[PDB]
Point group: none
Chain length 70, copies 4
Amino acid sequence: KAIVVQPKDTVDRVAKILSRNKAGSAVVMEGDEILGVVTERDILDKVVAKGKNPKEVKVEEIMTKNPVKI
Amino acid sequence: KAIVVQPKDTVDRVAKILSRNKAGSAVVMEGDEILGVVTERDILDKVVAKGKNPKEVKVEEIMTKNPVKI
Amino acid sequence: KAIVVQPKDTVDRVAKILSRNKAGSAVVMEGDEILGVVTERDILDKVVAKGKNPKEVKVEEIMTKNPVKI
Amino acid sequence: KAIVVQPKDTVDRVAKILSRNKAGSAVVMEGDEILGVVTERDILDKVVAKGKNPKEVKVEEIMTKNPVKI
């Protein structure tokens, strides 16, 4: 299961949404534009392990948005 | 950008869809049910590096679907 | 798979330890004594989703007590 | 970030080398001579999306020629 969230949703909010819905990931949508995806791995690896405060991080900042790239 | 694909789409097909659309990830949807997300990292790490043939793998098999779990 | 940490280690540091070592559990030890365990689910559910700052939280504050203490 | 491989290394093996070492490029060397480079984009675009089996493809078959050969 994945849940659709908005790009300004903060990481603390997104984490609760995912846990309470027993979802593994979110789909980040701005209106009818799908901008990227975010998993619980992204939350732990890009925010928590990185020393960032989840309430100060918008989910757009940690989603997979771009192709792989050297 | 993310592209919506179906759970039986094979990994070779999904990889082309992502490349041609310059998208970093796919959203796997069965009807109106969002089942999970898949990135180009999943493709390389779970299929290619694992020795699997992408045309013999359905994208449902490599998506993030479940919460993190011990 | 587990990694041993100290009670006073903060959640940001412990998160990085777990992911860099690809481990799911942090076993909290005070000298010789196993006090409890902290999982990534603990981290997400008790810290991130609760809107806490992981830098201001010590792993002792979210562990489950050692259920095999003798 | 690069890792050196051999021309006859298959794409499945090279994929695992790159990801386990968190590298983006495989520099193809025949003894002392740098023949070319293979990227993860190469891997996805020239192998997976083209519907090729990565086990049946040698990295020499998808590299860009060394543009700094003297």
